[PDB]
Coordinates of C-alpha atoms in Angstrom, one line a residue:
Chain A
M23 CA -41.6 36.7 -5.0
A24 CA -39.6 34.9 -7.4
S25 CA -38.9 31.1 -7.8
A26 CA -36.0 29.7 -5.9
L27 CA -34.4 27.7 -8.6
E28 CA -33.6 30.7 -11.0
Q29 CA -32.1 32.6 -8.1
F30 CA -29.9 29.7 -7.1
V31 CA -28.4 29.2 -10.5
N32 CA -26.5 32.5 -11.1
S33 CA -24.7 32.4 -7.6
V34 CA -22.7 29.2 -8.2
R35 CA -20.3 30.7 -10.7
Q36 CA -19.1 33.1 -8.0
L37 CA -18.2 30.5 -5.6
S38 CA -16.5 28.6 -8.5
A39 CA -14.3 31.8 -9.3
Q40 CA -13.3 32.0 -5.7
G41 CA -11.7 29.8 -2.9
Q42 CA -15.1 29.7 -1.1
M43 CA -16.2 26.3 -2.1
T44 CA -17.7 25.2 1.3
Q45 CA -20.7 27.4 0.5
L46 CA -21.2 25.8 -2.9
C47 CA -21.8 22.4 -1.3
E48 CA -24.8 23.8 0.4
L49 CA -26.2 25.4 -2.7
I50 CA -26.1 22.1 -4.7
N51 CA -27.6 19.9 -1.8
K52 CA -30.9 22.0 -1.4
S53 CA -31.1 22.7 -5.2
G54 CA -34.3 24.7 -5.1
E55 CA -36.2 23.0 -2.3
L56 CA -39.1 21.6 -4.3
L57 CA -38.2 20.7 -7.7
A58 CA -39.8 19.6 -11.0
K59 CA -39.1 20.3 -14.6
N60 CA -37.8 23.7 -13.5
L61 CA -34.1 22.6 -13.5
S62 CA -34.2 21.8 -17.2
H63 CA -34.6 25.5 -17.9
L64 CA -31.4 26.5 -16.0
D65 CA -29.2 24.2 -18.2
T66 CA -29.4 26.3 -21.3
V67 CA -27.6 29.4 -20.0
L68 CA -25.8 27.4 -17.3
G69 CA -22.4 27.7 -19.1
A70 CA -20.0 30.5 -18.5
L71 CA -16.9 28.6 -17.4
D72 CA -17.8 24.9 -17.9
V73 CA -21.3 24.2 -16.7
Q74 CA -19.8 24.4 -13.1
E75 CA -20.5 22.2 -10.0
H76 CA -24.2 23.1 -10.1
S77 CA -25.1 20.7 -12.8
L78 CA -24.3 17.7 -10.6
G79 CA -27.2 18.9 -8.2
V80 CA -29.6 19.0 -11.2
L81 CA -28.6 15.5 -12.3
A82 CA -28.9 14.1 -8.7
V83 CA -32.6 15.4 -8.3
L84 CA -33.7 14.3 -11.8
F85 CA -32.5 10.7 -11.3
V86 CA -33.6 10.6 -7.6
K87 CA -37.2 11.1 -8.6
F88 CA -37.8 7.3 -8.3
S89 CA -40.0 7.5 -11.4
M90 CA -39.0 8.7 -15.0
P91 CA -35.5 10.0 -15.3
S92 CA -36.7 12.8 -17.6
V93 CA -39.7 11.6 -19.7
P94 CA -38.9 8.9 -22.5
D95 CA -36.2 11.4 -23.6
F96 CA -33.8 9.9 -20.9
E97 CA -30.9 9.2 -23.4
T98 CA -30.4 13.0 -23.6
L99 CA -29.9 13.2 -19.8
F100 CA -27.3 10.5 -20.1
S101 CA -25.4 12.5 -22.8
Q102 CA -25.2 15.4 -20.3
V103 CA -23.7 13.4 -17.4
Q104 CA -20.8 11.9 -19.6
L105 CA -20.1 15.7 -20.5
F106 CA -20.0 16.6 -16.8
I107 CA -17.5 13.8 -15.9
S108 CA -15.3 14.3 -19.0
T109 CA -15.0 18.0 -20.0
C110 CA -15.8 19.7 -16.7
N111 CA -13.7 17.2 -14.6
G112 CA -14.1 18.6 -11.2
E113 CA -11.2 19.8 -9.0
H114 CA -13.3 20.7 -6.1
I115 CA -14.7 17.1 -6.2
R116 CA -13.6 16.1 -2.7
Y117 CA -16.5 18.2 -1.5
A118 CA -18.9 16.9 -4.1
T119 CA -18.3 13.2 -3.1
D120 CA -21.7 12.9 -1.2
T121 CA -23.9 14.0 -4.2
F122 CA -21.5 12.3 -6.8
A123 CA -21.9 9.0 -5.0
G124 CA -25.8 9.4 -4.6
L125 CA -26.1 10.2 -8.2
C126 CA -23.8 7.2 -9.3
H127 CA -25.8 4.6 -7.3
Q128 CA -28.9 6.1 -8.7
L129 CA -27.6 5.8 -12.3
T130 CA -26.7 2.1 -11.8
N131 CA -30.3 1.3 -10.5
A132 CA -31.9 2.9 -13.6
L133 CA -29.5 1.3 -16.1
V134 CA -30.2 -2.1 -14.5
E135 CA -34.0 -1.4 -15.3
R136 CA -33.2 -0.7 -19.1
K137 CA -32.5 -3.4 -21.7
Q138 CA -29.0 -4.0 -20.6
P139 CA -26.7 -2.2 -18.2
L140 CA -23.8 -2.3 -20.9
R141 CA -24.0 1.4 -22.0
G142 CA -23.5 2.4 -18.2
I143 CA -20.2 0.7 -17.6
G144 CA -18.2 3.1 -19.9
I145 CA -19.4 6.2 -18.2
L146 CA -19.2 4.7 -14.6
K147 CA -15.5 3.9 -14.7
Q148 CA -14.4 7.3 -16.0
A149 CA -16.7 8.8 -13.3
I150 CA -14.7 7.1 -10.4
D151 CA -11.4 8.2 -11.9
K152 CA -12.1 11.9 -11.2
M153 CA -12.5 11.6 -7.6
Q154 CA -9.2 9.5 -7.2
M155 CA -5.6 10.8 -6.6
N156 CA -4.0 8.8 -9.5
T157 CA -2.9 6.3 -6.9
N158 CA -6.5 4.9 -6.5
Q159 CA -8.6 5.3 -3.4
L160 CA -11.4 2.9 -2.8
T161 CA -15.1 4.3 -2.5
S162 CA -18.6 3.1 -3.2
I163 CA -18.6 3.8 -7.1
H164 CA -16.1 0.8 -7.2
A165 CA -18.7 -1.5 -5.9
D166 CA -21.3 -0.4 -8.4
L167 CA -18.9 -0.7 -11.3
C168 CA -18.5 -4.4 -10.5
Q169 CA -22.3 -4.7 -10.3
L170 CA -22.7 -3.4 -13.8
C171 CA -20.2 -5.8 -15.1
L172 CA -21.8 -8.7 -13.3
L173 CA -25.2 -8.2 -14.8
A174 CA -23.9 -7.5 -18.3
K175 CA -20.9 -9.7 -18.8
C176 CA -17.9 -7.7 -19.7
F177 CA -15.6 -8.1 -16.8
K178 CA -12.6 -6.7 -18.8
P179 CA -12.9 -2.8 -17.9
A180 CA -13.1 -3.4 -14.1
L181 CA -9.9 -5.4 -13.9
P182 CA -7.2 -2.5 -13.5
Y183 CA -9.3 -1.2 -10.6
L184 CA -9.3 -4.6 -8.9
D185 CA -5.8 -5.7 -9.7
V186 CA -4.5 -2.7 -7.6
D187 CA -4.4 -3.1 -3.8
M188 CA -4.7 0.1 -1.6
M189 CA -4.8 1.8 1.7
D190 CA -7.4 4.5 2.8
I191 CA -10.8 5.2 1.4
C192 CA -12.0 8.4 -0.3
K193 CA -13.4 10.6 2.4
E194 CA -14.3 14.1 3.5
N195 CA -18.0 14.9 3.3
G196 CA -19.4 11.3 3.9
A197 CA -20.3 9.3 0.7
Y198 CA -19.2 6.0 2.1
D199 CA -20.0 3.1 4.5
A200 CA -19.0 -0.5 5.4
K201 CA -21.6 -2.3 3.2
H202 CA -20.0 -0.7 0.1
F203 CA -16.7 -1.9 1.3
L204 CA -18.0 -5.5 1.7
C205 CA -20.0 -5.6 -1.6
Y206 CA -17.1 -4.2 -3.8
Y207 CA -14.9 -7.1 -2.3
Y208 CA -17.6 -9.8 -2.5
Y209 CA -18.2 -9.1 -6.2
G210 CA -14.4 -8.6 -7.0
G211 CA -13.9 -12.1 -5.6
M212 CA -16.7 -13.4 -7.7
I213 CA -15.2 -12.0 -10.8
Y214 CA -11.7 -13.3 -10.2
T215 CA -12.8 -16.9 -9.5
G216 CA -14.5 -16.7 -12.8
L217 CA -11.4 -15.7 -14.6
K218 CA -9.8 -18.7 -12.7
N219 CA -7.5 -16.3 -10.8
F220 CA -7.7 -18.2 -7.7
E221 CA -5.0 -16.1 -6.0
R222 CA -6.6 -12.7 -6.3
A223 CA -10.1 -14.2 -5.6
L224 CA -9.0 -15.6 -2.2
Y225 CA -7.5 -12.3 -1.2
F226 CA -10.6 -10.3 -2.3
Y227 CA -12.9 -12.7 -0.4
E228 CA -10.8 -12.4 2.8
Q229 CA -11.2 -8.6 2.9
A230 CA -15.0 -9.1 2.8
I231 CA -14.7 -11.2 6.1
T232 CA -12.0 -9.1 8.0
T233 CA -14.2 -6.0 8.0
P234 CA -15.5 -5.0 11.4
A235 CA -19.3 -5.4 12.0
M236 CA -21.6 -5.7 15.0
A237 CA -24.7 -6.6 13.0
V238 CA -25.7 -9.2 10.5
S239 CA -26.0 -8.6 6.8
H240 CA -26.8 -10.6 3.7
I241 CA -23.3 -9.8 2.2
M242 CA -21.5 -11.3 5.3
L243 CA -23.2 -14.8 4.7
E244 CA -22.4 -14.8 1.1
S245 CA -18.8 -13.6 1.6
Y246 CA -18.2 -16.6 4.0
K247 CA -19.9 -19.2 2.0
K248 CA -17.8 -18.1 -1.2
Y249 CA -14.7 -18.1 0.9
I250 CA -15.2 -21.8 1.9
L251 CA -15.7 -22.8 -1.8
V252 CA -12.5 -21.0 -3.0
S253 CA -10.4 -22.3 -0.2
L254 CA -11.6 -25.7 -1.2
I255 CA -10.1 -25.2 -4.6
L256 CA -6.8 -23.5 -3.6
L257 CA -6.3 -25.6 -0.4
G258 CA -6.9 -29.1 0.7
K259 CA -9.2 -27.8 3.5
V260 CA -10.4 -24.3 4.6
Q261 CA -7.5 -21.7 4.7
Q262 CA -6.9 -19.7 7.9
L263 CA -8.7 -16.5 9.1
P264 CA -6.9 -13.9 11.4
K265 CA -7.8 -13.1 14.9
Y266 CA -9.0 -9.6 13.8
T267 CA -12.0 -11.1 12.2
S268 CA -15.3 -9.8 13.2
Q269 CA -17.3 -11.5 16.2
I270 CA -20.4 -11.9 14.0
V271 CA -18.6 -14.4 11.5
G272 CA -18.2 -16.8 14.5
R273 CA -21.3 -16.4 16.6
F274 CA -24.1 -16.0 13.9
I275 CA -22.6 -17.1 10.6
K276 CA -21.2 -20.5 11.5
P277 CA -24.6 -22.4 12.3
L278 CA -25.9 -20.3 9.4
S279 CA -23.3 -22.0 7.0
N280 CA -23.7 -25.7 8.1
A281 CA -23.9 -27.2 4.6
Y282 CA -20.7 -25.6 3.6
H283 CA -19.0 -27.0 6.8
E284 CA -20.2 -30.4 5.7
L285 CA -18.8 -29.8 2.1
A286 CA -15.4 -29.0 3.7
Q287 CA -15.7 -32.1 5.9
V288 CA -16.5 -34.6 3.1
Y289 CA -13.6 -33.0 0.9
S290 CA -11.1 -33.8 3.8
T291 CA -12.1 -37.5 3.6
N292 CA -10.9 -37.3 0.0
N293 CA -13.6 -39.3 -1.6
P294 CA -15.5 -37.6 -4.7
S295 CA -18.4 -40.1 -4.6
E296 CA -19.5 -38.9 -1.3
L297 CA -19.0 -35.2 -2.1
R298 CA -21.2 -35.7 -5.2
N299 CA -24.0 -37.3 -3.2
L300 CA -23.8 -34.4 -0.7
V301 CA -24.2 -31.7 -3.4
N302 CA -27.6 -33.2 -4.3
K303 CA -28.7 -33.4 -0.7
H304 CA -27.7 -29.7 -0.1
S305 CA -28.9 -28.5 -3.6
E306 CA -31.7 -26.1 -2.6
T307 CA -29.5 -24.1 -0.4
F308 CA -27.0 -23.8 -3.3
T309 CA -29.6 -22.5 -5.6
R310 CA -31.3 -19.9 -3.2
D311 CA -27.9 -18.6 -2.1
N312 CA -26.8 -18.7 -5.8
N313 CA -23.3 -19.9 -5.6
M314 CA -24.3 -22.7 -7.9
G315 CA -21.7 -23.7 -10.4
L316 CA -18.9 -22.9 -7.9
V317 CA -20.0 -25.8 -5.9
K318 CA -19.3 -27.9 -9.1
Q319 CA -15.7 -26.6 -9.2
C320 CA -15.0 -27.8 -5.7
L321 CA -15.7 -31.3 -7.0
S322 CA -13.4 -31.0 -10.0
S323 CA -10.7 -29.6 -7.6
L324 CA -10.9 -32.8 -5.5
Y325 CA -10.2 -34.9 -8.5
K326 CA -7.2 -32.6 -9.2
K327 CA -6.0 -33.0 -5.6
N328 CA -6.4 -36.8 -5.8
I329 CA -4.4 -36.9 -8.9
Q330 CA -1.7 -34.5 -7.6
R331 CA -1.1 -36.3 -4.2
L332 CA -0.1 -39.4 -6.4
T333 CA 2.7 -37.5 -7.9
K334 CA 4.3 -37.0 -4.4
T335 CA 4.3 -40.6 -3.8
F336 CA 5.1 -42.3 -7.1
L337 CA 7.8 -41.9 -9.8
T338 CA 5.9 -44.0 -12.3
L339 CA 2.3 -45.3 -12.0
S340 CA -0.1 -46.8 -14.4
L341 CA -3.1 -45.2 -15.9
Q342 CA -5.3 -48.2 -15.0
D343 CA -4.0 -48.0 -11.5
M344 CA -4.6 -44.2 -11.4
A345 CA -8.1 -44.7 -12.7
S346 CA -9.2 -47.2 -10.1
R347 CA -7.7 -45.4 -7.1
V348 CA -8.8 -41.8 -8.2
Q349 CA -12.2 -43.3 -9.2
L350 CA -11.9 -41.7 -12.7
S351 CA -12.9 -45.2 -14.0
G352 CA -11.3 -45.1 -17.4
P353 CA -7.6 -44.9 -18.1
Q354 CA -8.4 -42.8 -21.0
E355 CA -9.7 -40.1 -18.7
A356 CA -6.6 -40.3 -16.5
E357 CA -4.5 -39.3 -19.5
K358 CA -7.1 -36.6 -20.4
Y359 CA -7.1 -35.2 -16.8
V360 CA -3.3 -34.8 -16.6
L361 CA -3.1 -33.3 -20.1
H362 CA -5.5 -30.5 -19.1
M363 CA -3.3 -29.8 -16.1
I364 CA -0.1 -29.8 -18.3
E365 CA -1.5 -26.9 -20.3
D366 CA -2.4 -25.2 -16.9
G367 CA 0.9 -25.9 -15.4
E368 CA -0.4 -27.5 -12.2
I369 CA 1.5 -30.6 -12.9
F370 CA 4.9 -31.6 -14.4
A371 CA 4.5 -34.9 -15.9
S372 CA 4.9 -37.0 -19.1
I373 CA 2.8 -39.8 -20.5
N374 CA 4.2 -43.1 -21.9
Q375 CA 1.7 -44.7 -24.1
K376 CA 3.9 -47.6 -25.1
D377 CA 4.1 -48.9 -21.4
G378 CA 0.7 -47.5 -20.4
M379 CA 2.3 -45.5 -17.6
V380 CA 2.5 -41.9 -16.4
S381 CA 6.0 -40.7 -15.4
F382 CA 6.1 -37.8 -13.1
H383 CA 8.9 -35.2 -13.4
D384 CA 8.7 -32.4 -10.9
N385 CA 11.7 -30.0 -11.5
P386 CA 10.7 -26.5 -12.5
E387 CA 13.5 -24.8 -10.5
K388 CA 16.9 -25.9 -9.3
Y389 CA 17.3 -22.5 -7.6
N390 CA 20.6 -21.6 -9.1
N391 CA 19.1 -20.0 -12.1
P392 CA 19.7 -16.3 -12.7
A393 CA 15.9 -16.3 -13.5
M394 CA 15.2 -17.1 -9.8
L395 CA 17.7 -14.2 -8.8
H396 CA 15.8 -11.7 -10.8
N397 CA 12.5 -13.0 -9.4
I398 CA 13.8 -12.7 -5.7
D399 CA 15.2 -9.2 -6.7
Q400 CA 11.7 -8.1 -8.0
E401 CA 10.1 -9.3 -4.8
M402 CA 12.5 -7.1 -2.7
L403 CA 11.4 -3.9 -4.6
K404 CA 7.8 -4.7 -3.6
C405 CA 8.8 -5.0 0.1
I406 CA 10.7 -1.8 0.1
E407 CA 7.7 0.1 -1.2
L408 CA 5.3 -1.7 1.3
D409 CA 7.5 -0.6 4.2
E410 CA 7.5 3.1 2.8
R411 CA 3.6 3.1 3.0
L412 CA 4.0 2.1 6.6
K413 CA 6.5 4.7 7.4
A414 CA 4.1 7.5 6.2
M415 CA 1.3 6.0 8.1
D416 CA 3.3 5.4 11.3
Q417 CA 4.6 9.1 11.1
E418 CA 1.0 10.3 10.6
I419 CA 0.0 8.8 14.1
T420 CA 3.3 10.3 15.4
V421 CA 1.9 13.8 14.4
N422 CA -1.4 13.0 16.0
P423 CA -1.3 13.3 19.9
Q424 CA -1.3 10.0 21.7
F425 CA -4.2 9.2 24.0
Chain B
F18 CA 0.6 -7.5 -32.3
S19 CA -2.0 -6.1 -34.6
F20 CA -4.6 -8.2 -32.9
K21 CA -4.0 -6.8 -29.4
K22 CA -4.7 -3.2 -30.6
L23 CA -7.9 -4.5 -32.4
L24 CA -9.2 -5.9 -29.1
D25 CA -8.5 -2.5 -27.4
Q26 CA -10.5 -0.4 -29.9
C27 CA -13.3 -3.0 -30.0
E28 CA -13.5 -3.3 -26.1
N29 CA -14.0 0.5 -25.9
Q30 CA -16.5 0.4 -28.7
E31 CA -18.8 -2.2 -26.9
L32 CA -19.7 0.1 -24.0
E33 CA -19.5 3.4 -25.8
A34 CA -21.5 3.0 -29.0
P35 CA -24.8 1.2 -28.6
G36 CA -28.0 1.7 -26.5
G37 CA -27.0 -1.5 -24.7
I38 CA -27.2 -4.0 -27.5
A39 CA -24.6 -3.4 -30.2
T40 CA -24.8 -4.4 -33.8
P41 CA -23.9 -7.9 -35.1
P42 CA -20.4 -7.5 -36.8
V43 CA -18.9 -5.8 -33.7
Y44 CA -19.8 -8.7 -31.4
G45 CA -18.5 -11.2 -33.9
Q46 CA -14.9 -9.7 -34.1
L47 CA -14.9 -9.3 -30.3
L48 CA -15.8 -12.9 -29.7
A49 CA -13.2 -14.1 -32.2
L50 CA -10.5 -11.8 -30.5
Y51 CA -11.2 -13.4 -27.2
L52 CA -10.4 -17.0 -28.6
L53 CA -6.9 -15.8 -29.9
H54 CA -5.9 -14.8 -26.3
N55 CA -7.5 -18.1 -25.2
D56 CA -9.5 -16.2 -22.6
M57 CA -12.4 -18.7 -23.0
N58 CA -14.3 -17.8 -19.8
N59 CA -14.9 -14.1 -21.0
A60 CA -15.8 -15.7 -24.5
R61 CA -18.4 -17.9 -23.0
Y62 CA -19.8 -15.1 -20.9
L63 CA -19.8 -12.9 -24.1
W64 CA -22.2 -15.5 -25.8
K65 CA -24.4 -15.6 -22.6
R66 CA -24.8 -11.8 -22.7
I67 CA -25.9 -12.1 -26.4
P68 CA -29.7 -12.1 -26.7
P69 CA -31.8 -14.5 -28.9
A70 CA -32.2 -11.6 -31.3
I71 CA -28.5 -11.7 -32.5
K72 CA -28.6 -15.5 -32.8
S73 CA -31.4 -15.4 -35.4
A74 CA -29.9 -12.4 -37.0
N75 CA -26.3 -13.7 -37.3
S76 CA -25.3 -17.3 -37.8
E77 CA -21.5 -16.6 -38.2
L78 CA -21.3 -15.6 -34.5
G79 CA -22.7 -18.9 -33.6
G80 CA -20.0 -20.7 -35.5
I81 CA -17.3 -18.7 -33.8
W82 CA -18.9 -19.9 -30.4
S83 CA -18.9 -23.5 -31.6
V84 CA -15.0 -23.7 -32.0
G85 CA -15.0 -22.4 -28.5
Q86 CA -17.3 -25.0 -26.9
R87 CA -14.7 -27.6 -28.0
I88 CA -11.7 -25.5 -26.7
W89 CA -13.5 -25.9 -23.3
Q90 CA -13.5 -29.7 -23.8
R91 CA -9.9 -29.4 -25.3
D92 CA -10.5 -31.9 -28.1
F93 CA -8.3 -31.1 -31.0
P94 CA -9.6 -32.9 -34.1
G95 CA -13.0 -31.3 -33.4
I96 CA -11.5 -27.7 -33.4
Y97 CA -10.2 -28.1 -36.9
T98 CA -13.5 -29.3 -38.6
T99 CA -15.3 -26.2 -37.1
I100 CA -12.5 -23.7 -38.4
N101 CA -13.5 -25.1 -41.9
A102 CA -17.2 -24.9 -41.3
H103 CA -17.7 -21.1 -41.4
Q104 CA -16.1 -18.1 -43.0
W105 CA -17.2 -14.7 -43.2
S106 CA -15.1 -12.5 -45.5
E107 CA -13.1 -9.4 -44.2
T108 CA -15.0 -9.0 -41.0
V109 CA -14.0 -12.5 -39.7
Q110 CA -10.9 -13.6 -42.0
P111 CA -7.7 -11.8 -40.6
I112 CA -8.5 -12.8 -37.1
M113 CA -9.6 -16.3 -38.2
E114 CA -6.2 -16.8 -39.9
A115 CA -4.6 -16.2 -36.5
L116 CA -7.1 -18.6 -34.6
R117 CA -6.2 -21.5 -36.8
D118 CA -2.3 -21.0 -36.3
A119 CA -2.8 -20.2 -32.5
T120 CA -4.5 -23.6 -31.9
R121 CA -1.8 -25.6 -34.0
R122 CA 1.0 -24.0 -32.0
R123 CA -0.9 -24.7 -28.8
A124 CA -1.2 -28.3 -30.0
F125 CA 2.4 -29.0 -30.9
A126 CA 3.6 -27.2 -27.8
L127 CA 1.2 -29.2 -25.7
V128 CA 2.3 -32.5 -27.1
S129 CA 6.0 -31.6 -26.7
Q130 CA 5.7 -31.2 -23.0
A131 CA 2.8 -33.7 -22.4
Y132 CA 4.0 -36.9 -23.9
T133 CA 7.5 -38.6 -23.7
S134 CA 5.9 -41.1 -26.2
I135 CA 2.7 -40.8 -28.3
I136 CA 0.9 -42.8 -31.1
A137 CA 1.5 -41.1 -34.6
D138 CA -2.4 -41.4 -35.5
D139 CA -3.3 -39.4 -32.2
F140 CA -0.6 -36.9 -33.2
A141 CA -2.2 -36.6 -36.6
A142 CA -5.4 -35.4 -34.9
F143 CA -3.5 -32.7 -32.9
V144 CA -1.6 -31.0 -35.7
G145 CA -4.6 -31.9 -37.8
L146 CA -2.7 -33.0 -41.0
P147 CA -2.5 -36.7 -42.1
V148 CA 0.1 -39.3 -41.2
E149 CA 2.3 -38.8 -44.3
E150 CA 2.5 -35.1 -43.9
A151 CA 3.3 -35.4 -40.1
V152 CA 6.0 -38.1 -40.1
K153 CA 7.8 -36.0 -42.8
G154 CA 7.7 -32.9 -40.5
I155 CA 8.8 -34.4 -37.1
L156 CA 12.0 -35.7 -38.7
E157 CA 13.2 -32.3 -39.7
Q158 CA 12.6 -30.7 -36.3
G159 CA 14.7 -33.5 -34.7
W160 CA 12.0 -35.6 -33.0
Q161 CA 12.4 -39.5 -33.2
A162 CA 9.8 -41.5 -34.9
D163 CA 9.7 -45.3 -34.4
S164 CA 8.4 -47.3 -37.3
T165 CA 6.9 -50.8 -37.4
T166 CA 4.9 -50.0 -34.2
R167 CA 4.4 -46.4 -35.5
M168 CA 5.1 -44.4 -32.3
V169 CA 6.5 -40.8 -32.1
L170 CA 8.6 -39.5 -29.2
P171 CA 8.8 -35.7 -28.4
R172 CA 11.9 -34.2 -27.1
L173 CA 25.4 -2.7 -8.2
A174 CA 22.3 -0.4 -8.5
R175 CA 19.9 -2.9 -6.8
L176 CA 22.4 -3.8 -4.1
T177 CA 23.0 -0.1 -3.1
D178 CA 19.2 0.5 -2.8
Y179 CA 19.0 -2.5 -0.5
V180 CA 22.0 -1.7 1.6
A181 CA 20.8 2.0 1.9
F182 CA 17.4 0.6 3.0
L183 CA 18.6 -1.7 5.8
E184 CA 21.1 0.8 7.2
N185 CA 18.9 3.9 7.1

């Protein structure tokens, strides 16, 4: 008889003219049973509407070879997938999610092999957009977007995906699991700390810990370890974890993260000289786990804390006095350190170089400004929308029968 | 204004156009554009993405990164010398013009908050113009200069939505 792949191609257009999409999901998955070059021949006379759903099945086999993507000619195959995502769109995509995701993870693995994964970022973000509502549902392509940005630094495209918080993942037909959930948040934390957006980083990092698990994974160690470092910047000791945290984070991970527990302990004494000595003791761990450079920030943040506690206590204090106590050891650096912080807005202070003093202010708000009224009013609109998400979700359980 | 749009078209262009390593002028504008926003982390990361191939090919790019190394230290007098060091016509100048004026404003603004009193010679480094030119300017703005010692002193609709919400 004839070949399976030619017979399969003409059928798809029928199922794409009709409401009978569930059939179509089967036809792309099998794809021709055994495949080779044979798919490349279908593409030429594949258009009659758009190129249809079928094309996605062709692209999934060719990249999933685990060899050449399509001879040294691979750039052509790349031009075809940007065409699928852009012009075709996909409105029957909810069904396609399994192949779409497989294909997308496979793309990222191949681009990572190439000279730089830069060229991949631009197709991969538009690729996610098509499966989403317009509200933004979180799925595994989100994780892989962050990975491309991490390797080839250009964090800027990924930020609108990250800066949005959500409820419910993209489902129906698989295409998703808890590791993807954890890796997306791990990396998204990694990026925000870099931007020095300590607020979003903390929050991203937390979501990578609160996830349920009954098994150990490499992402769970890293997520915990990065959490301790971030909380050492934001807070004066480690920040709280809820009681819906996974069992695994207590039982296995804590003797696993001993070094970090010692970082947090030395930081609580409030002495940089000791923290510094510890970082060289613990060094090899920092390098193998590769949260180097972050560990350095925790040291600068102690010096910031040590300067900032003085503010609480003193109206006026000398630079020489600050310098001995903080252990800056140079009044010139005391002046340099607050001045960095003035630009940042972590401190409200003024320098008197006639007297050789620092004067602390501390009066950003008197709380009777209309500025403060508008700020409180903006915060209320957020709450009323948050409640509305909860109402739709409580109601949804009300429809479901109770157990 | 104009610059913000210029980052947008360029940001798009980095991912879309090349095979993964884009050409030398595009990277230079983009780097220069990150310094105007004072988004120094992404700038630094930009240079680290840059291979050794572009650093030999293009020296201008390496000058733009040098201003930026100093911005990280936040040492003003050093910033100014580097602005003068390199120019690249058309391709670097409109954005460069903005970089120079963005750091001077940052510097005057910084000092105004930072110091209730400052030495005039240190201030001269910040704005980056000599003592005669500076002391002349401060007086017009309305800041006090002390002379002899030479010190310078810087100087219903919401409510119904909410009621509707709580009553329900």
